[PDB]
Amino acid sequence: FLTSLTVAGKDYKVLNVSYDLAQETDASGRPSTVTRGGRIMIEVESTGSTELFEWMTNNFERKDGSVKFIKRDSNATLKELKFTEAYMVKYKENFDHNSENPLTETFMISARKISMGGGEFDN
Amino acid sequence: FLTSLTVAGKDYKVLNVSYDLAQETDASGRPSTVTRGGRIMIEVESTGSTELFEWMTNNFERKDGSVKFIKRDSNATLKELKFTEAYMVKYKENFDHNSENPLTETFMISARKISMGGGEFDN
Amino acid sequence: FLTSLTVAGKDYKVLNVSYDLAQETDASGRPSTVTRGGRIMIEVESTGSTELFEWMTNNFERKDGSVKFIKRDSNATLKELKFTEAYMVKYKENFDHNSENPLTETFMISARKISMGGGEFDN
Amino acid sequence: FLTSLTVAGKDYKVLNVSYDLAQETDASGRPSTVTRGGRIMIEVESTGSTELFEWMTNNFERKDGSVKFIKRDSNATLKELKFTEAYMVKYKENFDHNSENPLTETFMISARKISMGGGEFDN
Amino acid sequence: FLTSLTVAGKDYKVLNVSYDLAQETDASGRPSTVTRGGRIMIEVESTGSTELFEWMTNNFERKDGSVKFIKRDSNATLKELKFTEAYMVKYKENFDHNSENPLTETFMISARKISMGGGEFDN
Amino acid sequence: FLTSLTVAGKDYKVLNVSYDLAQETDASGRPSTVTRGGRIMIEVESTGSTELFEWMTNNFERKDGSVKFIKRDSNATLKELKFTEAYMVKYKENFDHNSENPLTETFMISARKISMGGGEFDN
């Protein structure tokens, strides 16, 4: 499998992605209710581009974008995760000579809404 | 060994499952009593389907389903774990290019009751 | 080395066992005294049997049994740990496709007394 | 990929670098705002030079410098991170015979400002 | 290197040993003073013997003994650690089929005094 | 690379060394100031010597010494760390049959002053 990130017309080779949602439960089961969603964590090959660092610097800037998972063999876009109005919250560029893709960017954005396959979570 | 998850007539290849129950003890032994049960943790190959994400989005929706463990060599269903009226509590879709099954879904449901081989735990 | 668990006339291939006892010390040495013992942790190949799950469900049921360590080469029973009046306290059945014995049961019982080679600890 | 550190006209072979910025969020998203930036963590082959130890000793001394990431194959400077008025905050020289580059220096500096590709963070 | 434990005329093949002493410091250096010593941690191949379990059961019983480190090649006793009036404080017999020496005993004794090469620590 | 410890005219083959200094920062950067230094952690092949254990026993005894890092290929002393008036604070002799250098001594001394290449930190 192979995926990509798309922001501001710029595409980033994505090493790792994750996004999670959760509601608390009371006692056993007994969902407390209320839900948290919209935080997405990405790791990117840093390239020579500086654009992701500037977004972190910019702060209040909110953007839209999509995470597209492509089937390993086949070109066509098995699934795409779209986020709207996401703010840069944390950022870290790390170089490790020790292995593999030494220079990577790892950051977390907080989106107003994420959506996928007709599923929606808005804050 | 190989297992599967069955929900809403949809079958998911299951990488990891677990479900645990516990009662507290007082001093040594001296079970405090009261028991917790019904939480099940599953990890699934994500496919192109989006159905599990929507359930998390849906929130209050409760479902039934079964986890069926099939003997490695043989087709027939060594054991099946059935849950009734389970609510989506936590969900996380994670992509890791690093190894093996890169795209997986890891979630936890809280069932009103689980049952297996005549054994029962209801909340 | 190879060991087995014996409960209710049923024998379980045991992957891991442990049982520990401890008394607190005051300052350096200066045993506080009072002792804790009787908790035993076991991991079992799950088979198609459901019996251990039902015991956890049953709760208050106390049983007797023995853990028998057999010398690797030789049939004869190097040592046997016997417990009396043990209550099911925690239980977890876990499936991991990742390696080795994928389907295992891991549980902890709290015994009124354990004994071995003339040694005794009763609560 | 290969990088270097430049301080006081002295160049250090850099094994690991990292620098991170973060702002807190309130509830979900809801950035608390306020931001932290300017801390950089570096690991260096110790050589026979003692200069980095003296800076830690010196304490209040602030310096400028740059971290330059060079493309693996090619000489030219894919990206450079520049910091101004950075103070030595933590330092540790560690020798481990166990593997690889046994003698390394690991330290963290706190810069008044970092900048890269037109992006800026000042305190 | 190879070592052994000697208690009650019984010798135990020892896999791991450790014993540590410490005094607290105030601010930087500035030893707070007061010292802790005399606790020894050992891991033993369990054999068919039950003697170590009974000592834990016995509780208040204090014993003497020695830990003797023998040079790998040569018979003669490079160093020996002797303890006097040690009380059984913690004990755990653990079986792990996963590797190496599956059946081991891991316990900690609290000695009134340890001594080695003319060095002494008494409580 | 290879290093050695020198105390009381006795030389110890050193497996691991480390020494670190740090000052706290307020908010971002904003060094709180005040500094901690002088603690050195060493791991040594235990030999048949008992001298390091006695120093721990002795307690209040302060010593001087040096840690000398020798270039792997070449005899000459790439760098040497010298400490004056250091007190034995923690000590642990550990035997592990599992690998490599089974019998080692790991201890931490607190020096009044450390110095290296004209750099100085005194308490």
Question: Considering CB atoms only, which of C31, C118, C120 is closest to E110?
Answer: C31
Whether chain B has a CB inside 8 Å of the CB on A23: the answer is yes
Question: Considering CB atoms only, which of A49, A57, A94 is closest to D121?
Answer: A57
Residues 6+ apart with CB under 8 A from D113: D38, D83, D84, D85, D120, D121, D122, D123
What resolution in angstroms does the PDB record give? 2.5
Cβ pair B17, B108 in contact under 8 A? no
Q: Is A52 helix (H, G, I), strand (E, B) or coil?
A: helix
Question: Considering CB atoms only, which of C39, C56, C98 is closest to B21?
Answer: C56
Whether chain A has a CB inside 8 Å of the CB on B103: the answer is yes
Cβ pair B81, B119 in contact under 8 A? no
Pairing of strands F79-96, E10-22: antiparallel
CA distance D37 to A90: 10
Q: Which residue in D21, D49, D85, D95 has the most chain F C-beta atoms within 10 A of its own C-beta, making it the best mutation to test that interface?
A: D95
Give the residue from C72, C67, C94, C99 showing the smallest Cα distance to C83: C67
The reply to whether residue D29 touches residue A112, judged by beta carbons under 8 angstroms, is yes
Q: Which stretches does DSSP call E strand in F50-96? A: 62-70, 79-96
The reply to whether residue F33 touches residue D90, judged by beta carbons under 8 angstroms, is no
Burial per residue of B61-72, b for 16 or more beta-carbon CB atoms within 10 angstroms, e otherwise:
ebbebebbbbee
Whether chain E has a CB inside 8 Å of the CB on C118: the answer is yes
Residue of C nearest to B80 (CA): C48
Angle at A93 between CA A89 and CA A95, to 5 degrees: 160
Residue of A nearest to B50 (CA): A117
In angstroms, how far is CA F45 from the centroid of its own chain? 14
Whether chain D has a CB inside 8 Å of the CB on F74: the answer is no
Whether chain E has a CB inside 8 Å of the CB on C22: the answer is yes
Residues of A in contact with B93 (CB under 8 A): 18-20
Task: Give the helix, strand, coil percentages of chain F, each rounded to 5.
Answer: 5, 60, 35
The reply to whether residue B16 touches residue C53, judged by beta carbons under 8 angstroms, is no
DSSP B8: T
The reply to whether residue D95 touches residue F1, judged by beta carbons under 8 angstroms, is yes
Question: Considering CB atoms only, which of A14, A25, A116 is closest to B110?
Answer: A25
**Measuring CA to CA, how many Å separate B110 from each of B8, B86, B87?**
16, 5, 5
The Cβ of residue B53 has, within 10 Å, a number of other Cβ atoms equal to 27
Question: Considering CB atoms only, which of A22, A25, A117 is closest to B53?
Answer: A117
DSSP B36: B
Residues of A in contact with D71 (CB under 8 A): 48
Q: Which helix (H) or strand (E) holds E17?
A: strand E10-22
Burial class (CB in 10 A: 0-12, 13-18, 19+), B94: middle
Residues 6+ apart with CB under 8 A from B55: B61, B63, B88, B91
Residue contacts between D and F (CB atoms, under 8 Å): 88
The reply to whether residue F25 touches residue D110, judged by beta carbons under 8 angstroms, is yes
Cβ pair E65, E6 in contact under 8 A? yes
Can you read off the two tokens belonging to residue F61? 């005894």
Q: Which stretches does DSSP call E strand in chain D? A: 2-7, 10-22, 39-45, 62-70, 79-96, 103-116, 119-122
Residues 6+ apart with CB under 8 A from C91: B20, B21, B22, C52, C53, C55, C56, C105, C106, C107, C108
Residue contacts between C and E (CB atoms, under 8 Å): 88
The Cβ of residue F25 has, within 10 Å, a number of other Cβ atoms equal to 18
Cβ pair F89, F28 in contact under 8 A? no
